[PDB]
Design an enzyme around this catalytic site. Structure first.
Site, PDB file in Angstrom:
ATOM      1  N   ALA A 126       0.804  -1.214   0.000  1.00  0.00           N
ATOM      2  CA  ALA A 126       0.000   0.000   0.000  1.00  0.00           C
ATOM      3  C   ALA A 126       0.840   1.269   0.000  1.00  0.00           C
ATOM      4  CB  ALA A 126      -0.941   0.004   1.206  1.00  0.00           C
ATOM      5  N   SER A 185      -0.201  -2.699  12.434  1.00  0.00           N
ATOM      6  CA  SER A 185       0.342  -1.385  12.745  1.00  0.00           C
ATOM      7  C   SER A 185      -0.683  -0.296  12.449  1.00  0.00           C
ATOM      8  CB  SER A 185       1.620  -1.117  11.948  1.00  0.00           C
ATOM      9  OG  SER A 185       1.353  -1.030  10.558  1.00  0.00           O
ATOM     10  N   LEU A 222     -13.068 -14.223  25.121  1.00  0.00           N
ATOM     11  CA  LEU A 222     -12.936 -12.866  24.598  1.00  0.00           C
ATOM     12  C   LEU A 222     -13.992 -11.937  25.187  1.00  0.00           C
ATOM     13  CD1 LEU A 222     -12.122 -13.668  20.869  1.00  0.00           C
ATOM     14  CD2 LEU A 222     -10.555 -13.182  22.755  1.00  0.00           C
ATOM     15  N   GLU A 252     -15.053 -11.950  28.155  1.00  0.00           N
ATOM     16  CA  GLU A 252     -14.649 -11.546  29.499  1.00  0.00           C
ATOM     17  C   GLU A 252     -13.647 -10.400  29.474  1.00  0.00           C
ATOM     18  OE1 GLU A 252     -13.112 -13.570  33.647  1.00  0.00           O
ATOM     19  OE2 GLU A 252     -13.992 -14.885  32.127  1.00  0.00           O
TER      20      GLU A 252
HETATM   21  N1  LIG Z   1       6.965  -3.214  16.926  1.00  0.00           N
HETATM   22  C1  LIG Z   1       7.064  -3.376  15.610  1.00  0.00           C
HETATM   23  N2  LIG Z   1       6.690  -2.353  14.764  1.00  0.00           N
HETATM   24  C2  LIG Z   1       6.788  -2.510  13.423  1.00  0.00           C
HETATM   25  C3  LIG Z   1       7.262  -3.695  12.882  1.00  0.00           C
HETATM   26  N3  LIG Z   1       7.252  -3.572  11.536  1.00  0.00           N
HETATM   27  C4  LIG Z   1       6.783  -2.344  11.217  1.00  0.00           C
HETATM   28  N4  LIG Z   1       6.496  -1.674  12.378  1.00  0.00           N
HETATM   29  C5  LIG Z   1       5.953  -0.310  12.496  1.00  0.00           C
HETATM   30  O1  LIG Z   1       4.825  -0.208  11.651  1.00  0.00           O
HETATM   31  C6  LIG Z   1       4.811   1.033  10.977  1.00  0.00           C
HETATM   32  C7  LIG Z   1       4.852   0.788   9.476  1.00  0.00           C
HETATM   33  O2  LIG Z   1       3.816  -0.089   9.106  1.00  0.00           O
HETATM   34  P1  LIG Z   1       4.099  -1.533   8.450  1.00  0.00           P
HETATM   35  O3  LIG Z   1       3.378  -2.611   9.225  1.00  0.00           O
HETATM   36  O4  LIG Z   1       5.582  -1.808   8.375  1.00  0.00           O
HETATM   37  O5  LIG Z   1       3.464  -1.356   6.979  1.00  0.00           O
HETATM   38  P2  LIG Z   1       2.458  -2.417   6.303  1.00  0.00           P
HETATM   39  O6  LIG Z   1       1.398  -2.836   7.292  1.00  0.00           O
HETATM   40  O7  LIG Z   1       3.193  -3.614   5.746  1.00  0.00           O
HETATM   41  O8  LIG Z   1       1.754  -1.553   5.136  1.00  0.00           O
HETATM   42  P3  LIG Z   1       2.519  -1.172   3.770  1.00  0.00           P
HETATM   43  O9  LIG Z   1       3.944  -1.672   3.802  1.00  0.00           O
HETATM   44  O10 LIG Z   1       2.516   0.330   3.617  1.00  0.00           O
HETATM   45  O11 LIG Z   1       1.780  -1.797   2.614  1.00  0.00           O
HETATM   46  C8  LIG Z   1       6.030   1.805  11.442  1.00  0.00           C
HETATM   47  O12 LIG Z   1       5.623   2.660  12.485  1.00  0.00           O
HETATM   48  C9  LIG Z   1       6.936   0.728  11.990  1.00  0.00           C
HETATM   49  O13 LIG Z   1       7.721   1.234  13.042  1.00  0.00           O
HETATM   50  C10 LIG Z   1       7.641  -4.731  13.727  1.00  0.00           C
HETATM   51  O14 LIG Z   1       8.064  -5.787  13.259  1.00  0.00           O
HETATM   52  N5  LIG Z   1       7.540  -4.566  15.093  1.00  0.00           N
END
Ligand SMILES: Nc1nc2c(ncn2[C@@H]2O[C@H](COP(=O)(O)OP(=O)(O)OP(=O)(O)O)[C@@H](O)[C@H]2O)c(=O)[nH]1
Ligand SMILES: Nc1ncnc2c1ncn2[C@@H]1O[C@H](COP(=O)(O)OP(=O)(O)CP(=O)(O)O)[C@@H](O)[C@H]1O
Ligand SMILES: COc1cc(C(=O)c2c[nH]c(-c3cccc4[nH]ccc34)n2)cc(OC)c1OC
Ligand SMILES: Nc1nc2c(ncn2[C@@H]2O[C@H](COP(=O)(O)OP(=O)(O)O)[C@@H](O)[C@H]2O)c(=O)[nH]1
Ligand SMILES: [Ca+2]
Ligand SMILES: [Mg+2]
Ligand SMILES: [Mg+2]
Ligand SMILES: [Mg+2]
EC number: 3.6.5.-
Lengths: 437, 54, 427, 327
Positions: free
Chosen positions: A99, A140, A252, A254
């Site tokens: 995306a 995320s 869930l 609860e």
């Molecule tokens: N805690 C943690 N945060 C993550 C991780 N991977 C990505 N993030 C966080 O997630 C946010 C970015 O979203 P992503 O999940 O990487 O993106 P996506 O869901 O794959 O969506 P697109 O790549 O844009 O298609 C940023 O704020 C990153 O810091 C992870 O493995 N652990």
């Protein structure tokens, strides 16, 4: 026994899912090939762990999980990783192009091409369930898939599973490990669209986890792997009541009964202690009183905020290890005299306590030391609204100039959805102030 | 403090301590919105292609 | 996620050939297309710029275009000229004679369909096409006039792909002809509408760096292109190597471009080196960050303190403390508060790559979207108007069928672009 | 090198703190909405405490303690003192006060005084246990407090006064009492009969515009007041009054320390306070109110606003006039 289906959306959701399911297997004695020798009922059962694992005739224990990402890089590592045998190939769903950090692209343009397939693969798991109670959704806030597709999926799950509970584990964006400047936009857009469809959401601020890893694990530059192993310990601590014998938070429903007295205020604050480095050569094991007191230090919280300046609506203490009720009660008595713990006037001032005698499990070669007792506190406090205030302000700064808005309009979204989403966030902050001030 | 509903098992126990007493859209409208945004994309692309054709 | 590279005209093919030389070395690809590398970070994202032909040979996804056969032949005779696909050489016989109208309207239209056939052949091999990267100059006729005609037709056939350009701006310090402000103004008019991101490679800045900083009294095109190839390697590092960001052309545009027309970037590089020079002392992280943000290290002749940064992307290459990089990067923002916009949170992003470029242990590359780029367009607008107010040299263009109204519109659009950059400088 | 932001331009004290830090050359001022600051001189209401301490690589500090309003509002102070065991209903230095809303069955104390046969109070001063009637007519949460009918009266003049003490609490919760206090005099002789006209009863600088007769600006400093107590009463300011003042200040701020301390917080707080005291005829000190956004006295602005920079600001961001109340 009632089954729970886990859904991991986007990079953050998938990689945290990897950490959780790895931890689940170690906790239940399930090998990377899915075999569990301790399970004496071959090919089936209604045990507590069967909430998260179904069974094949060959004795394989397979996670009730779907992984979804709009690009294949991250899920391919699951397909070729240590636990590649754990998952059936139809549980791992990938597109060809992500995306691009754009909620509109994940929700409208691309998500619409794959939403029916995902629901079909979810329905396959639900058909294996004798009493499906609901879903656990990992994603995320900041990613285009984690924000855009998740909110699309949550809407459809309400349609297809109207009476099933839906819980969230949501990664709140932080500059220290940010991937996009528009993450505040995606966070506000997905929270607005998902708000009515989520019964309970555990937000994890990457800033809190990053700093905990730095201060307590002495990791100068935490990686996703460092963050996710810590996150998975807290997630496992939260879901343990669904997977082991117990009386507290056994379904869930609860979680929502115990933690969420008002539907829109469904974001409990998680606080975890103790976080101890494996490299620390000399360590003094922390008592019940010490780890319980640590639950009220903002430095140990999943979101940095000050609960002294809010009000509590519910409080849950989830202990693992050498803990007996007498010591919990003595610890609570002392802590109550010395700390600012104010409940709303329409809720009793009380803690729901669960104790599992097994100490936390740690991944071999990980950064967390083995501890004799640990605790995760789940409190619903209005202080978590500080995170909404921070997010909404960053949103306001960019949206006043309409910065980056054209990338969303170009995908078919309307400018009105930004302000409609922002009004909903404005109403959410007001709800938190009325209840908490 | 009042300790209530103590339940014990081999795996652990649970209880509650009280310190003080008190004082969705349909499938059709989702497709509605997914299609209205798609038509806005097709319109914007058709305007670009009309501009490139001039 | 494949990228299709196109180089048009003399300048475009010259800096284009150097780009393929530099990154082929970085990825361990020899002039015959064979891989001879230590590290497998060299091959993880090799598909972004290279096609893998049968026999474990890598061929650049590159299309070489000119209305003039000579520069094309010099590329083939170049050190890596034999690595290019022979079917991807598309050339005419006329030559555009530094005439935008010939490249865009007459001589170029004859050849543009043949290029699109090669572009189409390359696109149909692509697993998932990111978009396109074009190298060209704006002062000539082919890279400027035909290059922008190519961009328009590519957007017609691939409206949902990213269009990225490395566009060399003309300067009287290097000037080949008096009409270059005409060709550049007409080209910028096209780039504002039809590219998603344009790296402004300013020959004025390249000359000044060679003369003032590198102590080269008589800088040649080889000296200028040495800076260009170092810049092009840096700003594509996050596309070619695996990173925590997993960058691509679309994510770059989404995060660097808050407003569609303001997509002209100021590149920066540190350390600045001349060719064959001795680099025995590695720069420290404080030095890298300070130099990379210094106006002397900008590849566009604009004063960064005359505007504000909307967004900044920086890539540090080599073995170094990422913690220290963050400290220094956060430090330079604090000490220069007034030159970053307050209303875009986290608008300065840093990435790291373990592999340094050839001949250096530590380097830093800077991509800035600064409102100070208006100084570049103002400079070209002034040179344009000095001639246009007397209609000087217009007959070269009206002879090819162009009307004076078209010049008025291109000038007006570029002046609008200047006013738009000025609006966010005061915001 | 550090940076700060000013969000209360109407603040006299921090208008001078702004200039003093700028004149240091090592401090740069930003626009009030730039969040990459080191120090916020925040607004007086709805300061966004939730947005502080989330800037990577930046140590952030604010000139206000979140939650200090419980001490600096008339109604909450009465609450705070009665609800807190460290202070208690038996607190000996706060006037007997009640929160009357427009706990109004407080008359059992007023009607016990008529059964016990003085009973004038303040909200505003009358004796018939009714003004109440003026509290309902005003429509705002008010505090009814016993009026100190026998104050300490300065001679010459038979005048009444209150004492203002400036207290600085730093990020480490050190309590610093400014060594310079001030007496806000009355120029009208105290009339125990006519409480209607309140210019002999209200020592507020504004309520006195006879002003200026005995000392400049109706403000007497500690050196003169100490000399007066020696010549007239055979005692010192430290023994007869300041010991109680230091006890009250420490008692109040120690009570709320767990609620407001920023010890292990992601951001840090300091705050300048203004404590208002009254002295009765026995030389017993009474706490009147606590000011959360105090203005200083004209002569003392230079010294106090400097001392704010040394102890509260430059102690966090490195480049005595205070009594440290030890606890
Ligand atoms: N805690 C943690 N945060 C993550 C991780 N991977 C990505 N993030 C966080 O997630 C946010 C970015 O979203 P992503 O999940 O990487 O993106 P996506 O869901 O794959 O969506 P697109 O790549 O844009 O298609 C940023 O704020 C990153 O810091 C992870 O493995 N652990
Ligand atoms: N219980 C009491 N007994 C006698 N006098 C009292 C009193 N309470 C207040 N006063 C007198 O009224 C005057 C104003 O009282 P108060 O402190 O409530 O107003 P204020 O908020 O304007 C002080 P500041 O201007 O410093 O904030 C005081 O100077 C004092 O002389
Ligand atoms: C950091 O450096 C680079 C990044 C990117 C890129 O795709 C990206 C993703 N987010 C961002 C980004 C940009 C600006 C502010 C930001 N706040 C959060 C993310 C972000 N930029 C591409 C590069 O080169 C092609 C590159 O090298 C120079
Ligand atoms: N930096 C650089 N600029 C060049 C080079 N060759 C030509 N130019 C510039 O490009 C402009 C001339 O355009 P050119 O590419 O030669 O004509 P074209 O073949 O019709 O595209 C002038 O402003 C030159 O300064 C080169 O190798 N390097
Ligand atoms: Ca079984
Ligand atoms: Mg992704
Ligand atoms: Mg030429
Ligand atoms: Mg007052």
């Amino acid at each position: 026994m009632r089954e729970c289906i886990s859904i991991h959306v986007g990079q953050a959701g998938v990689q945290i899912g990897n950490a959780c399911w790895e931890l689940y297997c170690l906790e239940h004695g399930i090998q990377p090939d899915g075999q569990m020798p301790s399970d004496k009922t071959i090919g089936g059962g209604d045990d507590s762990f069967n909430t998260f694992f179904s069974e094949t005739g060959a004795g394989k224990h397979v996670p009730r999980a779907v992984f979804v990402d709009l690009e294949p890089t991250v899920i391919d590592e699951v397909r070729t990783g240590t636990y590649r045998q754990l998952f059936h190939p139809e549980q791992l769903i990938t597109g060809k192009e992500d995306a691009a950090n754009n909620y509109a692209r994940g929700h409208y343009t691309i998500g619409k091409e794959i939403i029916d397939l995902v629901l079909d693969r979810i329905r396959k798991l639900a058909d294996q369930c004798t009493g499906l109670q609901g879903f656990l959704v990992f994603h995320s806030f900041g990613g285009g898939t984690g924000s855009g597709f998740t909110s699309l999926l949550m809407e459809r799950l309400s349609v297809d599973y109207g009476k099933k509970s839906k819980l969230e584990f949501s990664i709140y964006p932080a500059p220290q490990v940010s991937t996009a400047v528009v993450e505040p936009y995606n966070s506000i857009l997905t929270t607005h669209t998902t708000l009515e469809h989520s019964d309970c959401a555990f937000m994890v601020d990457n800033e809190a986890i990053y700093d905990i890893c730095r201060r307590n694990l002495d990791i100068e530059r935490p990686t996703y792997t460092n963050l996710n192993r810590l996150i998975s310990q807290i997630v496992s601590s939260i879901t343990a009541s669904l997977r082991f014998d117990g009386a507290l938070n056994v379904d869930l429903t609860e979680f929502q009964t115990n933690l969420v007295p008002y539907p829109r205020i469904h974001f409990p604050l998680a606080t975890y202690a103790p976080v101890i480095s494996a490299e620390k050569a000399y360590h003094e094991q922390l008592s019940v009183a010490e780890i319980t007191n640590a639950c009220f230090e903002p430095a140990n919280q999943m979101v940095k905020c000050d609960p002294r300046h809010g009000k509590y609506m519910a409080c849950c203490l989830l202990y693992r290890g050498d803990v007996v009720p007498k010591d919990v009660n003595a610890a609570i008595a002392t802590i109550k005299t010395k700390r600012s713990i104010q409940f709303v006037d329409w809720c009793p001032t009380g803690f729901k306590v669960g104790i599992n005698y097994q100490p936390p499990t740690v991944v071999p070669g990980g950064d967390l030391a083995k501890v004799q007792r640990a605790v995760c506190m789940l409190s619903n406090t209005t202080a978590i609204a500080e995170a909404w205030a921070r997010l909404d302000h960053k949103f306001d700064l960019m949206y006043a100039k309409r910065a980056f808005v054209h990338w969303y309009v170009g995908e078919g979204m309307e400018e009105g959805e930004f302000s409609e989403a922002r009004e909903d966030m404005a109403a959410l902050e007001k709800d938190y102030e009325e209840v908490g001030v | 403090m009042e300790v209530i509903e103590l339940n014990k098992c081999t795996s652990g126990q649970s209880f509650e301590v009280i310190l003080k007493p008190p004082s969705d859209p349909s499938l059709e409208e989702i497709q509605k919105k997914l299609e209205a945004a798609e038509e806005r994309r097709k319109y914007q692309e058709a305007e670009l292609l009309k501009h490139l054709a001039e | 996620r494949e990228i299709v590279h196109i180089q048009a005209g003399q300048c475009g093919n010259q800096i284009g050939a150097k780009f393929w030389e530099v990154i082929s070395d970085e990825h361990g690809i020899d002039p015959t297309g064979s891989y001879h590398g230590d590290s497998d970070l060299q091959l993880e994202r090799i598909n972004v710029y290279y096609n893998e032909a049968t026999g474990n040979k890598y061929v650049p996804r590159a299309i070489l275009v000119d209305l003039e056969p000579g520069t094309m032949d010099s590329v083939r005779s170049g050190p890596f000229g034999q690595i290019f696909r022979p079917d991807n050489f598309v050339f005419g016989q006329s030559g555009a004679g530094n005439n935008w109208a010939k490249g865009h309207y007459t001589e170029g239209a004859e050849l543009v369909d043949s290029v699109l056939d090669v572009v189409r052949k390359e696109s149909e091999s692509c697993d998932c096409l990111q978009g396109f990267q074009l190298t060209h100059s704006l002062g000539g006729g082919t890279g400027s006039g035909m290059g922008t005609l190519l961009i328009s037709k590519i957007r017609e056939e691939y409206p949902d792909r990213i269009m990225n350009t490395f566009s060399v701006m003309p300067s009287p310090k290097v000037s080949d002809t008096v009409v270059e402000p005409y060709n550049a103004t007409l080209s910028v008019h096209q780039l504002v509408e039809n590219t998603d991101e344009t790296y402004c490679i300013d020959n004025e800045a390249l000359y000044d760096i060679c003369f003032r900083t590198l102590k080269l009294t008589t800088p040649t095109y080889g000296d200028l292109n040495h800076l260009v190839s170092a810049t092009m390697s840096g700003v594509t590092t996050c596309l070619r190597f695996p990173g925590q960001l997993n960058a691509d052309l679309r994510k770059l545009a989404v995060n660097m471009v808050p407003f569609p027309r303001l997509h002209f970037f100021m590149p920066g590089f540190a350390p600045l080196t001349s060719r064959g020079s001795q680099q025995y002392r590695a720069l420290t992280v404080p030095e890298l960050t300070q130099q990379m943000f210094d106006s002397k290290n900008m590849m566009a002749a604009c004063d960064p303190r005359h505007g504000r940064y909307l967004t900044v992307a920086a890539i540090f290459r080599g073995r170094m403390s990422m913690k220290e990089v963050d400290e220094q990067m956060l430090n330079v923002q604090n000490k220069n508060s007034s030159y970053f916009v307050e209303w875009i949170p986290n608008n300065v992003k840093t990435a790291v790559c373990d592999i340094p470029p050839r001949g250096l242990k530590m380097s830093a590359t800077f991509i800035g979207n600064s409102t100070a780029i208006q100084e570049l367009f103002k400079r070209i607008s002034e040179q344009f108007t000095a001639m246009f107010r007397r209609k000087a040299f217009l007959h070269w263009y009206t002879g090819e069928g162009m009307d004076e109204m078209e010049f008025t519109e291109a000038e007006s659009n570029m002046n609008d672009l200047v006013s738009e950059y000025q609006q966010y400088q005061d915001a | 090198m550090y940076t700060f932001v000013v969000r209360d331009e109407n603040s006299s004290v921090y208008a001078e703190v702004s200039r003093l830090l700028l004149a240091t050359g090592q401090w740069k001022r930003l626009r009030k909405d730039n969040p990459r600051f080191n120090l916020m001189l925040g607004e007086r209401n709805r300061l966004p405490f939730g947005r502080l301490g989330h800037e990577p690589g930046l140590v952030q500090l604010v000139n206000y303690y979140r939650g200090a309003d419980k001490l600096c509002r008339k109604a909450s102070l009465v609450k705070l003192i009665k609800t807190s065991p460290e202070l208690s209903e038996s607190c000996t230095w706060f006037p007997e006060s009640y929160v009357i809303y427009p706990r109004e069955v407080f008359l059992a104390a007023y009607n016990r005084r008529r059964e016990g046969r003085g009973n004038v109070w303040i909200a505003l001063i009358s004796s018939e246990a009714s003004e109440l009637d003026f509290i309902d007519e005003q429509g705002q949460v008010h505090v009814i407090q016993k009026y100190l009918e026998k104050p300490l009266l300065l001679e010459p003049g038979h005048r009444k006064f209150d004492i203002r003490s400036w207290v600085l609490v730093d990020h480490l919760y050190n309590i610093y009492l400014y060594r310079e206090g001030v007496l806000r005099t009355s120029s009208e002789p105290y009339n125990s009969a006519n409480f209607q006209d309140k210019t002999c009863h209200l020592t507020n600088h504004c309520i006195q515009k006879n002003y200026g007769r005995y000392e400049e600006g109706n403000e007497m400093f500690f050196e003169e007041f100490n000399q007066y107590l020696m010549d007239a009463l055979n005692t010192t300011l430290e023994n007869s009054i300041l010991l109680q003042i230091k006890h009250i200040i420490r008692s109040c701020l120690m009570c709320i320390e767990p609620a407001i301390s920023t010890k292990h917080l992601h951001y840090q707080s300091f705050q300048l306070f203004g404590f208002d005291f009254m002295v009765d005829e026995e030389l017993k000190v009474w706490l009147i109110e606590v000011n959360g956004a105090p203005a200083c006295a004209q002569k003392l602005y230079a010294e106090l606003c400097q001392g704010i920079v040394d102890v509260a600001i430059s102690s966090v961001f490195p480049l005595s006039i205070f009594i440290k109340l030890h606890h």
